Design a protein around this ligand. Structure first.
Ligand code: BDP
Length: 306
């Protein structure tokens, strides 16, 4: 059984490395009965195009941002809301515990032919722009690229900007020409997708912390034996933990490289951004009241139950 794994990120990126190591484990443990090949750098298309391919079995596995899964499986949008997690460490507790399992299961048990197996870390997303944004007010009227999810367009509009949905690969040229004034992402993406060449101001809003599911086509999943399925579950969960260490290293390295390239990291009070997005959490969070209560209550400890 052959697995093609699609990635939007370039070779060497922390997700890519963790995933190729996971694939090596699959090959070794199955004595070659499962083979694995990585297709990085967006060679198999945009994240939305790849998810479509996974649904019909043309691509066997991928990792994508949860941001673009929302339009396919609405119930995952609980993790896509602005400031749903208080910080990066809080998100990690969630994806490692019971609520993380529940949300993976909402993808798997959906009618959309995907099996969700683990969560990769993509840090926190902050706004980078061609001109400095030092306050909520400075964002007014700016065209900021977001991922293709109505939630993020509403979010950016609530912050007084103009959210423009675009595929990952379209951002570089749109920035170069001023078709957009900025975008929002973590430091490794800002660096490794070369967006810093056009945007030298990075405002640390941390407005989203979007986990990234690793998914398999359910068509492919159903061709595995139960023992192979257990192997896949095991090594996917191991990859969630391995990628965390790679992520922390890469994020810190990327921050330093970006500063050396002349990117200014601008600290801001998050409160005005939190307040501006209350309407978005009210709109999209109405049906997630219980989950939000449970998420908010995860704090000092590291329990599984939440
Ligand atoms: O915003 C984006 O397009 C990209 O953001 C990065 O942070 C994610 O790791 C990647 O999966 C997304 O495709």
């Amino acid at each position: 059984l052959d697995i093609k794994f699609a990635e939007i990120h370039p070779a060497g990126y922390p997700t890519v490395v963790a995933e190729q190591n996971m694939g090596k484990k699959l090959e070794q443990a199955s004595n070659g009965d499962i083979t694995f090949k990585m297709f990085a750098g967006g060679v198999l298309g945009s994240e939305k195009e790849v998810i479509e391919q996974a649904q019909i079995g043309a691509v066997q596995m991928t990792r994508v941002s949860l941001g673009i899964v929302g339009p396919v499986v609405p119930d995952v949008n609980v993790f896509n809301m602005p400031f749903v997690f208080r910080d990066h460490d809080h998100m990690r507790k969630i994806i490692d515990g019971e609520i993380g399992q529940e949300i993976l299961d909402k993808i798997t048990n959906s009618d959309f032919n995907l099996v969700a197996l683990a969560w990769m870390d993509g840090g926190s997303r902050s706004i980078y722009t061609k001109k400095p944004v030092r306050s909520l007010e400075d964002l007014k009227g700016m065209k900021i690229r977001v991922q293709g999810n109505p939630l993020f367009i509403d979010m950016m509009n609530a912050m007084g900007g103009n959210g423009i949905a675009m595929d990952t690969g379209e951002i570089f040229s749109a920035l170069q020409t001023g078709v957009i004034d900025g975008a929002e992402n973590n430091p490794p993406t800002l660096l490794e997708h070369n967006h810093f060449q056009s945007a030298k101001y990075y405002t640390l809003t941390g407005h989203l912390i979007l986990p990234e599911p690793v998914v398999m086509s359910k068509t492919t999943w159903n061709k595995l034996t139960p023992e192979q399925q257990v192997l896949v579950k095991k090594v996917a969960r191991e990859a969630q933990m391995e990628e965390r260490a790679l992520w922390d290293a890469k994020s810190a390295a990327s921050e330093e490289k970006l500063k050396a390239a002349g990117v200014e990291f601008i600290t801001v009070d998050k409160k005005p951004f939190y307040d501006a997005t209350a309407s978005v959490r009210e709109k999209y969070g109405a049906q997630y009241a219980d989950l939000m209560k449970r998420i908010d209550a995860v704090q000092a400890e590291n329990l599984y139950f939440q």
